[PDB]
Amino acid sequence: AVKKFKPYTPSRRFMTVADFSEITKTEPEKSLVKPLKKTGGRNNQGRITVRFRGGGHKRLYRIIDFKRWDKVGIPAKVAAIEYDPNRSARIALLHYVDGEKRYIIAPDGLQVGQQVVAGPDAPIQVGNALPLRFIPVGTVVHAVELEPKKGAKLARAAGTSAQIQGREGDYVILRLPSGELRKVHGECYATVGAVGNADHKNIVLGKAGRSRWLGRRPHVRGAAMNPVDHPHGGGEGRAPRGRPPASPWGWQTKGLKTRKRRKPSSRFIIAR
Amino acid sequence: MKRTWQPNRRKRAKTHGFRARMRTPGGRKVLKRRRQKGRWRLTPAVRKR
RNA sequence: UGGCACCUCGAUGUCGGCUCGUCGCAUCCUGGGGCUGAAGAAGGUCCCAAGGGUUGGGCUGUUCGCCCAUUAAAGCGGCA
RNA sequence: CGAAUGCCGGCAUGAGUAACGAUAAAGAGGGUGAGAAUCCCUCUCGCCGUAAGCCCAAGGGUUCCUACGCAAUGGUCGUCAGCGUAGGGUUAGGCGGGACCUAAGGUGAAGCCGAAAGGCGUAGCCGAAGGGCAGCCGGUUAAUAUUCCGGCCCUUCCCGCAGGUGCGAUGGGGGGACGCUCUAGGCUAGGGGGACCGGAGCCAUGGACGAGCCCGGCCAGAAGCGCAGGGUGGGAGGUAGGCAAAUCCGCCUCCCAACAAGCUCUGCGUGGUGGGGAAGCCCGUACGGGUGACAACCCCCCGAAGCCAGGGAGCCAAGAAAAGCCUCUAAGCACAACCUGCGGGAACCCGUACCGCAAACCGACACAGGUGGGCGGGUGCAAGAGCACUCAGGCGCGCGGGAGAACCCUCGCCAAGGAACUCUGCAAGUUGGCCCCGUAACUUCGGGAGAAGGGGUGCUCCCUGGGGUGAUGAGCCCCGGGGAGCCGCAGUGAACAGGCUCUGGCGACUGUUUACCAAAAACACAGCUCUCUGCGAACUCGUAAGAGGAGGUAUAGGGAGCGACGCUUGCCCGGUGCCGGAAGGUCAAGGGGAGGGGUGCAAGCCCCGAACCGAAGCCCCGGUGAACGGCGGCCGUAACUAUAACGGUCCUAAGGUAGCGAAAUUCCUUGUCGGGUAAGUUCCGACCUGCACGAAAAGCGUAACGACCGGAGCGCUGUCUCGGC
RNA sequence: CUAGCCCUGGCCAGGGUGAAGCUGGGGUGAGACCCAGUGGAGGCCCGAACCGGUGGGGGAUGCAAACCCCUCGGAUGAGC
RNA sequence: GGUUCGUGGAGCCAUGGGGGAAUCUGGGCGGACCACCGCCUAAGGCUAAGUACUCCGGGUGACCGAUAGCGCACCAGUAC
RNA sequence: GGGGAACCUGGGGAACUGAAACAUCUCAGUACCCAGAGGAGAGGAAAGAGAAAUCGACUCCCUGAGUAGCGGCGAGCGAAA
RNA sequence: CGCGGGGUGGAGCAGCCCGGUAGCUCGUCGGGCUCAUAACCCGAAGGUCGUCGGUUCAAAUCCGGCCCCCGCAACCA
Ligand SMILES: [Mg+2]
Ligand SMILES: [Mg+2]
Ligand SMILES: [Mg+2]
Ligand SMILES: [Mg+2]
Ligand SMILES: [Mg+2]
Ligand SMILES: [Mg+2]
Ligand SMILES: [Mg+2]
Ligand SMILES: [Mg+2]
Ligand SMILES: [Mg+2]
Ligand SMILES: [Mg+2]
Ligand SMILES: [Mg+2]
Ligand SMILES: [Mg+2]
Ligand SMILES: [Mg+2]
Ligand SMILES: [Mg+2]
Ligand SMILES: [Mg+2]
Ligand SMILES: [Mg+2]
Ligand SMILES: [Mg+2]
Ligand SMILES: [Mg+2]
Ligand SMILES: [Mg+2]
Ligand SMILES: [Mg+2]
Ligand SMILES: [Mg+2]
Ligand SMILES: [Mg+2]
Ligand SMILES: [Mg+2]
Ligand SMILES: [Mg+2]
Ligand SMILES: [Mg+2]
Ligand SMILES: [Mg+2]
Ligand SMILES: [Mg+2]
Ligand SMILES: [Mg+2]
Ligand SMILES: [Mg+2]
Ligand SMILES: [Mg+2]
Ligand SMILES: [Mg+2]
Ligand SMILES: [Mg+2]
Ligand SMILES: [Mg+2]
Ligand SMILES: [Mg+2]
Ligand SMILES: [Mg+2]
Ligand SMILES: [Mg+2]
Ligand SMILES: [Mg+2]
Ligand SMILES: [Mg+2]
Ligand SMILES: [Mg+2]
Ligand SMILES: [Mg+2]
Ligand SMILES: [Mg+2]
Ligand SMILES: [Mg+2]
Ligand SMILES: [Mg+2]
Ligand SMILES: [Mg+2]
Ligand SMILES: [Mg+2]
Ligand SMILES: [Mg+2]
Ligand SMILES: [Mg+2]
Ligand SMILES: [Mg+2]
Ligand SMILES: [Mg+2]
Ligand SMILES: [Mg+2]
Ligand SMILES: [Mg+2]
Ligand SMILES: [Mg+2]
Ligand SMILES: [Mg+2]
Ligand SMILES: [Mg+2]
Ligand SMILES: [Mg+2]
Ligand SMILES: [Mg+2]
Ligand SMILES: [Mg+2]
Ligand SMILES: [Mg+2]
Ligand SMILES: [Mg+2]
Ligand SMILES: [Mg+2]
Ligand SMILES: [Mg+2]
Ligand SMILES: [Mg+2]
Ligand SMILES: [Mg+2]
Ligand SMILES: [Mg+2]
Ligand SMILES: [Mg+2]
Ligand SMILES: [Mg+2]
Ligand SMILES: [Mg+2]
Ligand SMILES: [Mg+2]
Ligand SMILES: [Mg+2]
Ligand SMILES: [Mg+2]
Ligand SMILES: [Mg+2]
Ligand SMILES: [Mg+2]
Ligand SMILES: [Mg+2]
Ligand SMILES: [Mg+2]
Ligand SMILES: [Mg+2]
Ligand SMILES: [Mg+2]
Ligand SMILES: [Mg+2]
Ligand SMILES: [Mg+2]
Ligand SMILES: [Mg+2]
Ligand SMILES: [Mg+2]
Ligand SMILES: [Mg+2]
Ligand SMILES: [Mg+2]
Ligand SMILES: [Mg+2]
Ligand SMILES: [Mg+2]
Ligand SMILES: [Mg+2]
Ligand SMILES: [Mg+2]
Ligand SMILES: [Mg+2]
Ligand SMILES: [Mg+2]
Ligand SMILES: [Mg+2]
Ligand SMILES: [Mg+2]
Ligand SMILES: [Mg+2]
Ligand SMILES: [Mg+2]
Ligand SMILES: [Mg+2]
Ligand SMILES: [Mg+2]
Ligand SMILES: [Mg+2]
Ligand SMILES: [Mg+2]
Ligand SMILES: [Mg+2]
Ligand SMILES: [Mg+2]
Ligand SMILES: [Mg+2]
Ligand SMILES: [Mg+2]
Ligand SMILES: [Mg+2]
Ligand SMILES: [Mg+2]
Ligand SMILES: [Mg+2]
Ligand SMILES: [Mg+2]
Ligand SMILES: [Mg+2]
Ligand SMILES: [Mg+2]
Ligand SMILES: [Mg+2]
Ligand SMILES: [Mg+2]
Ligand SMILES: [Mg+2]
Ligand SMILES: [Mg+2]
Ligand SMILES: [Mg+2]
Ligand SMILES: [Mg+2]
Ligand SMILES: [Mg+2]
Ligand SMILES: [Mg+2]
Ligand SMILES: [Mg+2]
Ligand SMILES: [Mg+2]
Ligand SMILES: [Mg+2]
Ligand SMILES: [Mg+2]
Ligand SMILES: [Mg+2]
Ligand SMILES: [Mg+2]
Ligand SMILES: [Mg+2]
Ligand SMILES: [Mg+2]
Ligand SMILES: [Mg+2]
Ligand SMILES: [Mg+2]
Ligand SMILES: [Mg+2]
Ligand SMILES: [Mg+2]
Ligand SMILES: [Mg+2]
Ligand SMILES: [Mg+2]
Ligand SMILES: [Mg+2]
Ligand SMILES: [Mg+2]
Ligand SMILES: [Mg+2]
Ligand SMILES: [Mg+2]
Ligand SMILES: [Mg+2]
Ligand SMILES: [Mg+2]
Ligand SMILES: [Mg+2]
Ligand SMILES: [Mg+2]
Ligand SMILES: [Mg+2]
Ligand SMILES: [Mg+2]
Ligand SMILES: [Mg+2]
Ligand SMILES: [Mg+2]
Ligand SMILES: [Mg+2]
Ligand SMILES: [Mg+2]
Ligand SMILES: [Mg+2]
Ligand SMILES: [Mg+2]
Ligand SMILES: [Mg+2]
Ligand SMILES: [Mg+2]
Ligand SMILES: [Mg+2]
Ligand SMILES: [Mg+2]
Ligand SMILES: [Mg+2]
Ligand SMILES: [Mg+2]
Ligand SMILES: [Mg+2]
Ligand SMILES: [Mg+2]
Ligand SMILES: [Mg+2]
Ligand SMILES: [Mg+2]
Ligand SMILES: [Mg+2]
Ligand SMILES: [Mg+2]
Ligand SMILES: [Mg+2]
Ligand SMILES: [Mg+2]
Ligand SMILES: [Mg+2]
Ligand SMILES: [Mg+2]
Ligand SMILES: [Mg+2]
Ligand SMILES: [Mg+2]
Ligand SMILES: [Mg+2]
Ligand SMILES: [Mg+2]
Ligand SMILES: [Mg+2]
Ligand SMILES: [Mg+2]
Ligand SMILES: [Mg+2]
Ligand SMILES: [Mg+2]
Ligand SMILES: [Mg+2]
Ligand SMILES: [Mg+2]
Ligand SMILES: [Mg+2]
Ligand SMILES: [Mg+2]
Ligand SMILES: [Mg+2]
Ligand SMILES: [Mg+2]
Ligand SMILES: [Mg+2]
Ligand SMILES: [Mg+2]
Ligand SMILES: [Mg+2]
Ligand SMILES: [Mg+2]
Ligand SMILES: [Mg+2]
Ligand SMILES: [Mg+2]
Ligand SMILES: [Mg+2]
Ligand SMILES: [Mg+2]
Ligand SMILES: [Mg+2]
Ligand SMILES: [Mg+2]
Ligand SMILES: [Mg+2]
Ligand SMILES: [Mg+2]
Ligand SMILES: [Mg+2]
Ligand SMILES: [Mg+2]
Ligand SMILES: [Mg+2]
Ligand SMILES: [Mg+2]
Ligand SMILES: [Mg+2]
Ligand SMILES: [Mg+2]
Ligand SMILES: [Mg+2]
Ligand SMILES: [Mg+2]
Ligand SMILES: [Mg+2]
Ligand SMILES: [Mg+2]
Ligand SMILES: [Mg+2]
Ligand SMILES: [Mg+2]
Ligand SMILES: [Mg+2]
Ligand SMILES: [Mg+2]
Ligand SMILES: [Mg+2]
Ligand SMILES: [Mg+2]
Ligand SMILES: [Mg+2]
Ligand SMILES: [Mg+2]
Ligand SMILES: [Mg+2]
Ligand SMILES: [Mg+2]
Ligand SMILES: [Mg+2]
Ligand SMILES: [Mg+2]
Ligand SMILES: [Mg+2]
Ligand SMILES: [Mg+2]
Ligand SMILES: [Mg+2]
Ligand SMILES: [Mg+2]
Ligand SMILES: [Mg+2]
Ligand SMILES: [Mg+2]
Ligand SMILES: [Mg+2]
Ligand SMILES: [Mg+2]
Ligand SMILES: [Mg+2]
Ligand SMILES: [Mg+2]
Ligand SMILES: [Mg+2]
Ligand SMILES: [Mg+2]
Ligand SMILES: [Mg+2]
Ligand SMILES: [Mg+2]
Ligand SMILES: [Mg+2]
Ligand SMILES: [Mg+2]
Ligand SMILES: [Mg+2]
Ligand SMILES: [Mg+2]
Ligand SMILES: [Mg+2]
Ligand SMILES: [Mg+2]
Ligand SMILES: [Mg+2]
Ligand SMILES: [Mg+2]
Ligand SMILES: [Mg+2]
Ligand SMILES: [Mg+2]
Ligand SMILES: [Mg+2]
Ligand SMILES: [Mg+2]
Ligand SMILES: [Mg+2]
Ligand SMILES: [Mg+2]
Ligand SMILES: [Mg+2]
Ligand SMILES: [Mg+2]
Ligand SMILES: [Mg+2]
Ligand SMILES: [Mg+2]
Ligand SMILES: [Mg+2]
Ligand SMILES: [Mg+2]
Ligand SMILES: [Mg+2]
Ligand SMILES: [Mg+2]
Ligand SMILES: [Mg+2]
Ligand SMILES: [Mg+2]
Ligand SMILES: [Mg+2]
Ligand SMILES: [Mg+2]
Ligand SMILES: [Mg+2]
Ligand SMILES: [Mg+2]
Ligand SMILES: [Mg+2]
Ligand SMILES: [Mg+2]
Ligand SMILES: [Mg+2]
Ligand SMILES: [Mg+2]
Ligand SMILES: [Mg+2]
Ligand SMILES: [Mg+2]
Ligand SMILES: [Mg+2]
Ligand SMILES: [Mg+2]
Ligand SMILES: [Mg+2]
Ligand SMILES: [Mg+2]
Ligand SMILES: [Mg+2]
Ligand SMILES: [Mg+2]
Ligand SMILES: [Mg+2]
Ligand SMILES: [Mg+2]
Ligand SMILES: [Mg+2]
Ligand SMILES: [Mg+2]
Ligand SMILES: [Mg+2]
Ligand SMILES: [Mg+2]
Ligand SMILES: [Mg+2]
Ligand SMILES: [Mg+2]
Ligand SMILES: [Mg+2]
């Protein structure tokens, strides 16, 4: 869902925040499996390289499990569901019999106390992780490895979900959240389900302020700056682009494709 | 009318310090001429404890 | 309103208003006066004559101008 | 050398002129001294008091104290000084740093990269107002004191003796550990009272020897006690995780315990014991010393934003690390070793003066500026760190004396009128606190509201209802209600405290901005669309290494434009851009050599060079507008005129839809009608021949907001008539 | 100095409005919903410190190479 | 890239890339190239002297003489 | 391992100016940066020069020569035997 | 009063640049079709190519002045 607020103040008239029903019982994180001092700062050694980043609430990183193939077989009871402030999606804190606890980017439908596991064996069911190729062609899964043993990467952004279309020799075809069709190695694990909190997309920040809470600094439009500063700037009294819309740097911003052609990654993909 | 000069020992010993000049290849050259020139102070005077 | 560009570009601050005026007469008024398509009363026009007067408002940055309300009259123009 | 607004130096002119640095204010009698408004003293007077007063940090560095002095520095004087000379003065295991820890960031064995300088970078190291860690009250000096001394109380190290125990790591684990807003229960600093306790004294001018006036009624403190509250389940089995191992943590299962009790740890009382302790009077340069005292040191009431504290509740934007400290076991060692008692020794380096919202710091000056933290009393005003007065404390600002013109500044008042002032009611007024009536359109239901506009507000006596601390009564504090009555011109009696309506433009809104002429209708902004990006992402910085993106992964990242919200966002891809086109034309090195040439007696050695195979780009075919952009001319027609729904004809890629419209866009133009005014180039409503509006360089609206810009009116006024004191 | 961001600390008197949630009542087949009360939200409101710097006046060889006075803006936040 | 040589008929000496021998009847040079005729032995290394400079010491001057001469004749690279 | 006024070799390497504009060219391989060398450094016994069947390691001075040449054949630059 | 385009039968365009002929659509006029009109079919007529001069053997067409119509310009002042 999502809560709305009675307009007892502007900037509240439209604000809405994700409710935390399935936020189980939590608030504080497990101080072992995470957290980690999270190095905040909006640029590389020296200069800034990603404009409009800075300030905004403190944060402790949650070292979450991205390769479940580690503990094959060893199962786990889902202890609870926590709020992680570093990712759209919610996370699950689970207790393995092994005695080791880990956090798992939590899927939708996942219930506390319920159980799960990883490995070829594993049953096709919400939360269990299997090598792609042992998954029922046509069953949506999330958290997906790209190249075997190289960790999880596709679908893990709340409501995100990949889907098996078929398989060829080694690979299985997948439709990532981008509609794009791609082939991935059978060995790559993927954990069945489909992430959760598919509502995130429906929060309305409401006020300029909240965008700073998240840590997003005000964004200056090009058509506001001066020639020296940007390709879109000058003469004023407002003004149309006067040239194909460009970036601060000079490349066309609407249209101009940027994926480099001669890439090895192709030969494995078929359109977006 | 807060001005340009707001004294700060550390800031000063750390910025124009003797060890500072040595660290950089440009720092060295400063001293080098400061010596050649015959200055009584190679680095700025600023103490502590 | 312009033309010329003669002193001033090691600087001669430009509209308008306010303040303070002072000069001119090609007199708006008040004084004389000739004429008159001047019965009277009003005027018209032209000749002497500034001595002194030459209102308050609405609209506009305005100067000008259009109005409101009066007046004996509600002058025009020079003084960077 | 006369000139270069020449260069260096000197000395003039203005000029005995402007000034002498906040309008907080001075006056007198003594002192001293060659000489004093200006220095010491005393008595009056005035100013600061959420200070113009105390304590701390930075910075400054001897400016501290004292004895001599006054040429110069002090915007005057100087017998004074923060000035000259000289001499003293800054005393720790417990306070702050270092012999402890880690943050961002530095540096940096490996290892990576660079023409050289040099750039990265794992572990470690450095790095702090953050963590950790053992002290309070008094007395003392001219000047230092949680350091010196007194009383009381702690901390580690080494050795020794007695007693427990598998002891032991830089490794495992636990803890340290953490947000914001609102809060409870107790305490404390702190304060107000007192019919009670202790006090030198006073009855003054009409009155009072009175439960009168006035001063003061505490502070520190181990053990044990209490009184608050913080912490934490004990067992037994297993065990494949915590990268060795564990008897430890972490998991399963079963016993007991279970909004607790128990063991712990703080704070607060009390505590052996120690210390202080006014007024006033007397000496007295200074500004301390006695006396008061064998001082008393008790009772209430108010009470923290501070303590118990890792306490609790709610919320989302979801809130450091490392050591100390416990515990678990490794190599080791088990005569070691730790742990606990108790003794005895050992306990370093640096800072410590003084100014410190300022005459000793940053502003060239004893510069009306700027500077982080804590304490900051009392009464009153509804509250308060506000305002007025005043404690303690500290000041009258380092030129004065007279006068009583113009003129300037700052301030007060005003007849009648009231904005007639002016670009504009600019400025100044008006209004202003709190309690109670009572409030419209419009609205996104919140708002508009403190709308507007009203009345009350002082003091005296009576009656009476509730709170808190005692106990359910007394007193002491804190919230009310009703009833009579007094006095003034006036009762938030002074000081702090909105002028108010109507209607337009722009931007939705709180925010940002040209530090030193613009705060805005500009920027930002939630939100909307477009486009790139499948992850060694795209983009950005970088020669590279590497890094930001991101320990992110399409409900996410980057780029662009518009810019809450409502209703909408027409038509045109001809030219340009970007996307898609395994065909064609063109196309460079290169491949290939038809064939020609220079040389040699030749084998040869050397040069050229046409077919034809040869990319991307371009040409060519298509697409695409919240991609750059564009979105017609001329004639003719209807029951009077007028217009023109209709037509004819050129022209295009297509020929501006809705909606608005003399507008932030209208030249002619003070367009023409209405409305407001006695009068209206502006203003509001209309109309449209829109010089030259128009749909995300968005279009038209829009409740609410604007120190934004425009037009009315009410109130009130020296803005003005018209000045005056 | 000034701009931004990263690490670690600190600061914001006193008033006012009163959201969601709760609790009870009402209502219904069960609801939504409607009341009170409790509750404490918010780039909410009045207003000191604090951060600003709106309008006017003074200052213009200044107290000052941007200052003073009255008057205004924000003031738990995109806060200092 | 160097040489006078900036493509020029562009050689010679260096090379970054590519291809890639030979051992003296081997191999480079004589300004495209070839043939004669000459010259010289590349792909390892070292080597006095004559040459340059003058912080330092000394000698002289049709050199300066305290605004000159070094910025400093003076406790100056100081004070500021 | 670092220093030393200049001098020296090497690794890099400008611009104003000149061309009475400017772009090749010039200013210049100059300024400056970097590394190294020492009282010097560099170079040095020939796969040299060049027309004489000639010279005979390198370095430095004078000539040759502002010649030969180079060159928007402009400005100007400029050898060796 | 700068610079550019233009003015062709009743309407609106082409012809002109590379001088010798003036073409197109509509309308106009006659005939047809229909009871009739429009539509439709057949046929026809219709223009000093602004105007005054000039170049040539010859001008709409090439040159110059005048006039009128449209587009852009009129700025620092
Ligand atoms: Mg938490
Ligand atoms: Mg940790
Ligand atoms: Mg750096
Ligand atoms: Mg913040
Ligand atoms: Mg954004
Ligand atoms: Mg923007
Ligand atoms: Mg701009
Ligand atoms: Mg820049
Ligand atoms: Mg540009
Ligand atoms: Mg532009
Ligand atoms: Mg414009
Ligand atoms: Mg698609
Ligand atoms: Mg300065
Ligand atoms: Mg600093
Ligand atoms: Mg004239
Ligand atoms: Mg002039
Ligand atoms: Mg002059
Ligand atoms: Mg002058
Ligand atoms: Mg004037
Ligand atoms: Mg006359
Ligand atoms: Mg007469
Ligand atoms: Mg008048
Ligand atoms: Mg007006
Ligand atoms: Mg006059
Ligand atoms: Mg002369
Ligand atoms: Mg004078
Ligand atoms: Mg005078
Ligand atoms: Mg002065
Ligand atoms: Mg004077
Ligand atoms: Mg003074
Ligand atoms: Mg006196
Ligand atoms: Mg005296
Ligand atoms: Mg005085
Ligand atoms: Mg005194
Ligand atoms: Mg006395
Ligand atoms: Mg007070
Ligand atoms: Mg304060
Ligand atoms: Mg003062
Ligand atoms: Mg200090
Ligand atoms: Mg000083
Ligand atoms: Mg001294
Ligand atoms: Mg003394
Ligand atoms: Mg003395
Ligand atoms: Mg003196
Ligand atoms: Mg003085
Ligand atoms: Mg002075
Ligand atoms: Mg003096
Ligand atoms: Mg003093
Ligand atoms: Mg002294
Ligand atoms: Mg001690
Ligand atoms: Mg201290
Ligand atoms: Mg030691
Ligand atoms: Mg030591
Ligand atoms: Mg250590
Ligand atoms: Mg250390
Ligand atoms: Mg670190
Ligand atoms: Mg190193
Ligand atoms: Mg480094
Ligand atoms: Mg360390
Ligand atoms: Mg702490
Ligand atoms: Mg600390
Ligand atoms: Mg410690
Ligand atoms: Mg300590
Ligand atoms: Mg204690
Ligand atoms: Mg002292
Ligand atoms: Mg003491
Ligand atoms: Mg002691
Ligand atoms: Mg102890
Ligand atoms: Mg023992
Ligand atoms: Mg034992
Ligand atoms: Mg043990
Ligand atoms: Mg053992
Ligand atoms: Mg250990
Ligand atoms: Mg230990
Ligand atoms: Mg540990
Ligand atoms: Mg919490
Ligand atoms: Mg409490
Ligand atoms: Mg007390
Ligand atoms: Mg008390
Ligand atoms: Mg009190
Ligand atoms: Mg009292
Ligand atoms: Mg008392
Ligand atoms: Mg008391
Ligand atoms: Mg009493
Ligand atoms: Mg009593
Ligand atoms: Mg008594
Ligand atoms: Mg007594
Ligand atoms: Mg008594
Ligand atoms: Mg007695
Ligand atoms: Mg007595
Ligand atoms: Mg007595
Ligand atoms: Mg008496
Ligand atoms: Mg008393
Ligand atoms: Mg008393
Ligand atoms: Mg006490
Ligand atoms: Mg006590
Ligand atoms: Mg247990
Ligand atoms: Mg066991
Ligand atoms: Mg184990
Ligand atoms: Mg193990
Ligand atoms: Mg307990
Ligand atoms: Mg206790
Ligand atoms: Mg205690
Ligand atoms: Mg006790
Ligand atoms: Mg005692
Ligand atoms: Mg006493
Ligand atoms: Mg005493
Ligand atoms: Mg005496
Ligand atoms: Mg005395
Ligand atoms: Mg005594
Ligand atoms: Mg006694
Ligand atoms: Mg309390
Ligand atoms: Mg508090
Ligand atoms: Mg509290
Ligand atoms: Mg606490
Ligand atoms: Mg808590
Ligand atoms: Mg508790
Ligand atoms: Mg062993
Ligand atoms: Mg022992
Ligand atoms: Mg012991
Ligand atoms: Mg002991
Ligand atoms: Mg000791
Ligand atoms: Mg001290
Ligand atoms: Mg001290
Ligand atoms: Mg002082
Ligand atoms: Mg002090
Ligand atoms: Mg201050
Ligand atoms: Mg302070
Ligand atoms: Mg002070
Ligand atoms: Mg003084
Ligand atoms: Mg000073
Ligand atoms: Mg002073
Ligand atoms: Mg001052
Ligand atoms: Mg000063
Ligand atoms: Mg400040
Ligand atoms: Mg301050
Ligand atoms: Mg207080
Ligand atoms: Mg009292
Ligand atoms: Mg007070
Ligand atoms: Mg009262
Ligand atoms: Mg009050
Ligand atoms: Mg005050
Ligand atoms: Mg006051
Ligand atoms: Mg009193
Ligand atoms: Mg006093
Ligand atoms: Mg003071
Ligand atoms: Mg005094
Ligand atoms: Mg004064
Ligand atoms: Mg003073
Ligand atoms: Mg009076
Ligand atoms: Mg009054
Ligand atoms: Mg009056
Ligand atoms: Mg009156
Ligand atoms: Mg009036
Ligand atoms: Mg009136
Ligand atoms: Mg008026
Ligand atoms: Mg007026
Ligand atoms: Mg007027
Ligand atoms: Mg107005
Ligand atoms: Mg005003
Ligand atoms: Mg009033
Ligand atoms: Mg009033
Ligand atoms: Mg209402
Ligand atoms: Mg009212
Ligand atoms: Mg009232
Ligand atoms: Mg009274
Ligand atoms: Mg009764
Ligand atoms: Mg009562
Ligand atoms: Mg009672
Ligand atoms: Mg109480
Ligand atoms: Mg009562
Ligand atoms: Mg009566
Ligand atoms: Mg009365
Ligand atoms: Mg009354
Ligand atoms: Mg009052
Ligand atoms: Mg009132
Ligand atoms: Mg009052
Ligand atoms: Mg007031
Ligand atoms: Mg108010
Ligand atoms: Mg408005
Ligand atoms: Mg308007
Ligand atoms: Mg705005
Ligand atoms: Mg709008
Ligand atoms: Mg701006
Ligand atoms: Mg500002
Ligand atoms: Mg400004
Ligand atoms: Mg301003
Ligand atoms: Mg503003
Ligand atoms: Mg929108
Ligand atoms: Mg790059
Ligand atoms: Mg974006
Ligand atoms: Mg996007
Ligand atoms: Mg915009
Ligand atoms: Mg807009
Ligand atoms: Mg197009
Ligand atoms: Mg296109
Ligand atoms: Mg196309
Ligand atoms: Mg293409
Ligand atoms: Mg070829
Ligand atoms: Mg070829
Ligand atoms: Mg042949
Ligand atoms: Mg032949
Ligand atoms: Mg040959
Ligand atoms: Mg191609
Ligand atoms: Mg072509
Ligand atoms: Mg248009
Ligand atoms: Mg119109
Ligand atoms: Mg109008
Ligand atoms: Mg209008
Ligand atoms: Mg208007
Ligand atoms: Mg009218
Ligand atoms: Mg009016
Ligand atoms: Mg009208
Ligand atoms: Mg527009
Ligand atoms: Mg437009
Ligand atoms: Mg459109
Ligand atoms: Mg558009
Ligand atoms: Mg509009
Ligand atoms: Mg509006
Ligand atoms: Mg605002
Ligand atoms: Mg600042
Ligand atoms: Mg800024
Ligand atoms: Mg901070
Ligand atoms: Mg409420
Ligand atoms: Mg029910
Ligand atoms: Mg309610
Ligand atoms: Mg409620
Ligand atoms: Mg409450
Ligand atoms: Mg607020
Ligand atoms: Mg406000
Ligand atoms: Mg204020
Ligand atoms: Mg404070
Ligand atoms: Mg101001
Ligand atoms: Mg002024
Ligand atoms: Mg003036
Ligand atoms: Mg306000
Ligand atoms: Mg406020
Ligand atoms: Mg050439
Ligand atoms: Mg060359
Ligand atoms: Mg050859
Ligand atoms: Mg090669
Ligand atoms: Mg041979
Ligand atoms: Mg060769
Ligand atoms: Mg060769
Ligand atoms: Mg030859
Ligand atoms: Mg040879
Ligand atoms: Mg050899
Ligand atoms: Mg040698
Ligand atoms: Mg010599
Ligand atoms: Mg000699
Ligand atoms: Mg001489
Ligand atoms: Mg000299
Ligand atoms: Mg010398
Ligand atoms: Mg000498
Ligand atoms: Mg060296
Ligand atoms: Mg070189
Ligand atoms: Mg140049
Ligand atoms: Mg040139
Ligand atoms: Mg030029
Ligand atoms: Mg050259
Ligand atoms: Mg040598
Ligand atoms: Mg030789
Ligand atoms: Mg030359
Ligand atoms: Mg002309
Ligand atoms: Mg015609
Ligand atoms: Mg016919
Ligand atoms: Mg017919
Ligand atoms: Mg003809
Ligand atoms: Mg002819
Ligand atoms: Mg211009
Ligand atoms: Mg202009």
Side-chain angles (χ1 to χ4, degrees), chain A residues 138-219:
Chain A
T139 49
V140 301
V141 45
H142 73 284
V144 184
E145 270 191 284
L146 194 79
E147 308 176 34
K149 259 52 105 298
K150 264 183 173 176
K153 287 174 172 45
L154 293 51
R156 35 190 264 186
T160 16
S161 41
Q163 194 189 71
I164 330 283
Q165 231 65 169
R167 68 193 73 169
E168 311 320 307
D170 286 280
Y171 304 131
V172 310
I173 296 76
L174 283 185
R175 141 135 58 53
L176 332 178
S178 305
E180 170 174 299
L181 278 186
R182 190 193 217 298
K183 309 186 308 180
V184 189
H185 203 113
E187 300 316 303
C188 291
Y189 272 66
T191 129
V192 60
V195 191
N197 182 181
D199 294 299
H200 190 69
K201 60 192 293 270
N202 306 317
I203 41 179
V204 174
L205 285 188
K207 59 169 171 186
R210 186 121 77 125
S211 219
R212 291 293 275 302
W213 294 358
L214 288 186
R216 306 205 250 254
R217 296 265 320 297
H219 193 144

Side-chain angles (χ1 to χ4, degrees), chain A residues 1-29:
Chain A
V2 66
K3 313 176 199 62
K4 282 184 182 173
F5 296 56
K6 306 186 89 309
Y8 48 78
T9 156
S11 60
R12 204 74 187 188
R13 161 174 281 114
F14 308 128
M15 195 190 280
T16 66
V17 63
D19 65 300
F20 311 95
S21 34
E22 258 307 302
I23 243 321
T24 196
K25 296 69 181 176
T26 306
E27 295 153 344
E29 317 289 304

